[PDB]
Design an enzyme around this catalytic site. Sequence first.
Site, PDB file in Angstrom:
ATOM      1  N   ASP D 197      30.419  11.788  26.291  1.00 17.24           N
ATOM      2  CA  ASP D 197      31.116  12.812  27.051  1.00 17.24           C
ATOM      3  C   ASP D 197      32.106  12.210  28.046  1.00 17.24           C
ATOM      4  OD1 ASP D 197      31.254  15.724  28.055  1.00 17.24           O
ATOM      5  OD2 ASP D 197      30.643  14.670  29.873  1.00 17.24           O
ATOM      6  N   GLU D 233      34.518  11.445  23.338  1.00 12.93           N
ATOM      7  CA  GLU D 233      35.342  12.615  23.595  1.00 12.93           C
ATOM      8  C   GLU D 233      36.560  12.200  24.417  1.00 12.93           C
ATOM      9  OE1 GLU D 233      34.596  15.019  26.926  1.00 12.93           O
ATOM     10  OE2 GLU D 233      35.001  16.914  25.934  1.00 12.93           O
TER      11      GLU D 233
HETATM   12 CL   LIG Z   1      33.359  17.675  21.285  1.00 13.60          CL
END
Ligand SMILES: [Cl-]
Lengths: 195, 195, 496, 496
Positions: D197, D233
Amino acid sequence: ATETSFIIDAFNKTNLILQGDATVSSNGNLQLSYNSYDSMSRAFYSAPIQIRDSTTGNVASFDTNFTMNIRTHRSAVGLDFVLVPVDTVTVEFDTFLSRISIDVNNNDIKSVPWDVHDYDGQNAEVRITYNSSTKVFSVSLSNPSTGKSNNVSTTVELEKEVYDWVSVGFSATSGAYQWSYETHDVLSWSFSSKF
Amino acid sequence: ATETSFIIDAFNKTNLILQGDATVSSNGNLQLSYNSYDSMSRAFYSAPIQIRDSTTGNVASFDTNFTMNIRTHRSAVGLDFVLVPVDTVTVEFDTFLSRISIDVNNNDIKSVPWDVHDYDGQNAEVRITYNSSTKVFSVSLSNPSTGKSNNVSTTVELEKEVYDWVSVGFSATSGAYQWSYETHDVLSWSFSSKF
Amino acid sequence: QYAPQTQSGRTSIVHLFEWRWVDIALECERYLGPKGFGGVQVSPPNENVVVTNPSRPWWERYQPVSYKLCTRSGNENEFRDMVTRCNNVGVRIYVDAVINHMCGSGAAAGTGTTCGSYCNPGSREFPAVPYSAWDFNDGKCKTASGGIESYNDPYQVRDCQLVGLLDLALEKDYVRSMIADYLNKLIDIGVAGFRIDASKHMWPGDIKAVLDKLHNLNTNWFPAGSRPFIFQEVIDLGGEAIQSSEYFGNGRVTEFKYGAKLGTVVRKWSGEKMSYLKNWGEGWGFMPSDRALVFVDNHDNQRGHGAGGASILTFWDARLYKVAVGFMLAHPYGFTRVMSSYRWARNFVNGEDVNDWIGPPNNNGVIKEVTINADTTCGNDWVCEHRWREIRNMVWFRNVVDGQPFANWWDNGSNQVAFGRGNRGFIVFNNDDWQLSSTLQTGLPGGTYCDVISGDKVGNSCTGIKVYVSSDGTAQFSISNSAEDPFIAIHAESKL
Amino acid sequence: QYAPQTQSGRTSIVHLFEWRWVDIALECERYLGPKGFGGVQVSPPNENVVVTNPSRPWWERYQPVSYKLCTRSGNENEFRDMVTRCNNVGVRIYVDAVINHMCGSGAAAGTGTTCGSYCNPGSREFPAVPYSAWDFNDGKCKTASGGIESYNDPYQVRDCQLVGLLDLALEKDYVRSMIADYLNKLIDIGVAGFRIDASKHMWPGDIKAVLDKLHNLNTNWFPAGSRPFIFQEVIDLGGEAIQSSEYFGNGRVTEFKYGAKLGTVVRKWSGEKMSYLKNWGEGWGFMPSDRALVFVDNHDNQRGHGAGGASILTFWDARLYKVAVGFMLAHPYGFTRVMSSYRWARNFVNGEDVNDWIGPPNNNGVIKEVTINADTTCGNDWVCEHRWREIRNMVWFRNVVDGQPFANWWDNGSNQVAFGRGNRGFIVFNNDDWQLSSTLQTGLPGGTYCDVISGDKVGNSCTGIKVYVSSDGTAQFSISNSAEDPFIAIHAESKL
Ligand SMILES: [Cl-]
Ligand SMILES: *[C@@H]1O[C@H](CO)[C@@H](O[C@@H]2O[C@H](CO)[C@@H](O)[C@H](O)[C@H]2NC(C)=O)[C@H](O)[C@H]1NC(C)=O
Ligand SMILES: *[C@@H]1O[C@H](CO)[C@@H](O[C@@H]2O[C@H](CO)[C@@H](O)[C@H](O)[C@H]2NC(C)=O)[C@H](O)[C@H]1NC(C)=O
Ligand SMILES: *[C@@H]1O[C@H](CO)[C@@H](O[C@@H]2O[C@H](CO)[C@@H](O)[C@H](O)[C@H]2NC(C)=O)[C@H](O)[C@H]1NC(C)=O
Ligand SMILES: *[C@@H]1O[C@H](CO)[C@@H](O[C@@H]2O[C@H](CO)[C@@H](O)[C@H](O)[C@H]2NC(C)=O)[C@H](O)[C@H]1NC(C)=O
Ligand SMILES: *[C@@H]1O[C@H](CO)[C@@H](O)[C@H](O)[C@H]1NC(C)=O
Ligand SMILES: *[C@@H]1O[C@H](CO)[C@@H](O)[C@H](O)[C@H]1NC(C)=O
Ligand SMILES: [Ca+2]
Ligand SMILES: [Ca+2]
Ligand SMILES: [Ca+2]
Ligand SMILES: [Ca+2]
Ligand SMILES: [Ca+2]
Ligand SMILES: [Ca+2]
Ligand SMILES: [Cl-]
């Protein structure tokens, strides 16, 4: 729609698109054909101009002034002002044919003869105007020093999709053999379009 | 030197440089951040603008108006007007920090707070002006419907080589997580520079 | 079509512009052969119209009236003699083939031609060929004037008249055959290849058709199955409809971007610096090296720059010209052509030179012979750049390093540059307004080398600068910005 | 890092967004395993701060307070049970690793956390980790606000606070080690890889440092020496300083240009036509296929488009969404991820949706279980796109054609397109406002095939459309623009 206006009292490569033998000299002159022969060189303003708004079918009026200096050293050979779709409309100052033409799609809509000898090596002021109402396209050429002038006007229809957006600028052609040495300079240029 | 002026009442991709999530909608609105999050999108006028003439050291005065519509759906997050050298001078409408800043080289030269709630989802008129004589840079924001306004001015020094030529435009940033949904629209834009 | 067909080891050709066949023949034996020159590009050998106003300009030779080998340079026997004598000493002859057109449509009918042939341009009659009105493009041309009116239309530039010259119908087999017979006669005489004049004004396919009809080279001097070397004159600086690449299938193409770019850099204009030449060649947007014929200036573009503003370098700017030619001759990109000119009087009338038309040195129209002075220079107004020590030694340098890769590049971040060619040659330039004093890796074997720019290796010594390369290949270089020739070059054959 | 580590033959992963561990475990056994799904991306399994205003939004899970496996999805034992059960039926688990930051600096000190851990965000105290003030980037950040003020400055986006979240000092070995221990505990449990993330907000080298500290995968289910699959990401649409390529050395990167471009094309906006997809992939300026993780929409970007103007396609536009997902699943570019969502009430207040924050279906904050209806659809507001026949059958299609080259492309110059994958599959789309009636070369062996979009191959028959491919591989196709699903897909395993 976009209306745009610009005034260039001295050129700079930064806001120009140069193709072929087109350069800007140290003193701000746009120079074309100085280093070559039998070829075409072009210089366009970096931003495309909207001549026709597709949303309303409205066609813009434009006005442009520029001072040039052609040196024959003595269009097939000459300096042309062009509106190139991003079907080209050209104003030709042909020194080989000794004629000034309002050309559209390679078809000379109107032309008058001119004596290149009256402007050779001297600063010539050119004004090209198009009134979308009357649809009149006019060209004025004058030697401010001698008072000589040449004018040509006609009606051109720019009410076509192809003319929505165009690149505005100059196109200079140098000939071959004895016609290999003509140089072209543009010292200043102002342009304005309006709906 | 080149002075240029343009008026855009409705946008078109043709005379723009779009980077990232920047598009022009069918109705002529410049839209930024609609499809993405945690990223920056930019839109510049295709032709570079001369802010400083190196030949004379002269710096130009400029004036620009634009109407925007920011929708928070609730700069770090916001819409910025930028002058990027071809050392960036930015006017930030930061919705995350709730401040309007005049930033130069990432340094906020001056900033005032603003209540995004007074302009959220509504057409806001923005005017940015720079007078090279007094060297005063001013920003005016107003909601024509409610009569609310926010203003901020300071003195900025653009008399540096880096500011000779710049690309003028917009930069919009979308945040992450709960701040992922802000959209930015610019409906019209007029710009004018003069020496 | 791409191979020059030069003798073993020879890498350049020189344009002996407007020279007489007898003088070229002598030059081949007394200089070009011994000095390692690969070949000579000769002016058009076929009959042309006589222009008396101006008085016999250089450009009258680009207005053919027949294919008889009879011009101011000489006659057929003198031409044959030249080809034979040059080939015998290993120097090839490349002919300037003017095949896109005949003379000007406005030329007077008559016998005012270099060989007395009759022609009636007005009625498109060239009985000495023969060509008739139907052998021209008059009916195919789309313009109202019959001339080229826009270079953005390929059909106009190829099918219409180039500056009033009668345009040949090159798609017709008859025309193709007449031209092929002319070229084949030259090949049989011993010519190694051709410069195709005005190639931009002919369709690539038409040129190809003519080329396919050509014989292999004369086995008296060439191996069996040798095809003639072909270089097409196409001026493509990028601003138009026709591209140089359209002609890659016929042979080499003149890369006009080369000299224009190089000139700007060497002059240090438009913010250019010599350090930028690091990726010279295809890196600068030039055509593939194996398709390129390069040069600093040519017979046409060396003219018309009296008023300045032009980047093209010529013998008129000797110092900068030698640096540019030296860089070209040292760099691996393309096949090189050296220019050899005659000087003319640069006289201005209202800001423009009026003598760009002037033809070769002459006595009432008869071309003067090339006289050689004791100092190996030429008299009678022939400049003979090919005889300048700096240029002469650099064509030798190119032969010596032939095949060696570009290596050991160095630059001072400004206008001081250096590079070598494998382990056979190294060259260093100082185009900055200050002294060059650095120790550089030359890539060459240790030893003492004679700088071939300031002198020569004569016997057991050097006549000019000596460069001492240590066992590790490094050498100390000192070049003053005030030096007559601000560059030094050494190679395997200048080693003591 | 680039290999998904899925079982033999499985080519897609599905994001079971906000699902409870017990429901995922059951889904693995009753559906994902049998239906050939390669894996599941799970919501963050570590403890997060509780947000009560708004009431338990989906985004509270991206504000860590500790690394204890204790969230609304379940506890550590339930998580272990899920990983074991899924692995046993050949479905892998990929964890959403939130490692760039902890919770918001403005969060209240207390025990309002999903597992009752204490923390004092104001003083950067996370005793359950433990982390102290010196484990954050407060002193390194160059801005006066301490937050990111310009995305054109890499230092600001990586070292400053992302929307007020306390930014971890990832260059410190202590921090790197704490995170590595968390990830290694997951690997040992049996996790196959991680979604990193907010990767744009961390230095590629720092991520690399953590990755180098990770164990190989659990040999109970993975071959010895297997490295965890990594997908970062990074939102890079081209308008900024940080580029996706900076992360290629750590593993795969999310290609956000994919879904945005595809959405514009399928919707036929901005003059785009499906015929333009001929060179889809790197041809459109996308990253290398072997570095890409692709998808039509993700949990974040499927929200915020209630007012229109957005090209992103989601379950809200079912018809167009199925076409886009089908094209993605059929095309060889990238590793594919399928989205599986829950529906929320799209309510507007002054022209903007106010429910983009709404969390998963729940009873007073307790996530509702996923109920399966007799028609294989889900209840309790879970949309279960992964269960839609059209999507289910296309993930099967991707497994079947795995490795086969893109072939036999056809288009009508407008919005009717077709292509195959070697000799194992063929797909045809009609996105034009008129009927598609053409005979096309499918590249498949002759026979009768069941269209897997309108039905299934059940026993000795097809439940939907049947396609008859002649011996020469050609087949007649008829697709009405009024069809519920304007596309047909056939493959080696749907053949009768
Ligand atoms: Cl994603
Ligand atoms: C066009 O504008 C450019 C940019 O201002 C000029 O380039 C600069 O000239 C200034 C003043 O001499 C120098 O200090 C800078 O170093 C230049 N920038 C670069 C990269 O060269 C340029 O001189 C202008 N050209 C003309 C013809 O006006
Ligand atoms: C081009 O030059 C023409 C001629 O000077 C300009 O037209 C004039 O503008 C001047 C100054 O404002 C007025 O005094 C005159 O009344 C105008 N007409 C004439 C015939 O002189 C025109 O503005 C210029 N256009 C552009 C785009 O620069
Ligand atoms: C921007 O201008 C372009 C060019 O005029 C517009 O594109 C054209 O729209 C017209 C009118 O609908 C069509 O007839 C042409 O086919 C279009 N050209 C192309 C290639 O699409 C475009 O609509 C304009 N955009 C906006 C937002 O005004
Ligand atoms: C931006 O908008 C401002 C404010 O309207 C413009 O300034 C005015 O121009 C109008 C119309 O000519 C005048 O009536 C006013 O006197 C001007 N000042 C004010 C305070 O209203 C300005 O011309 C615009 N600039 C651009 C580049 O469009
Ligand atoms: C164009 O012509 C119209 C009609 O004759 C005239 O009234 C108007 O002033 C003109 N406009 C421009 C911009 O020249
Ligand atoms: C800029 O400020 C000067 C000096 O106060 C003022 O006289 C002038 O009108 C201003 N010019 C512009 C273009 O704003
Ligand atoms: Ca014409
Ligand atoms: Ca010339
Ligand atoms: Ca700032
Ligand atoms: Ca968004
Ligand atoms: Ca011709
Ligand atoms: Ca961070
Ligand atoms: Cl040449």
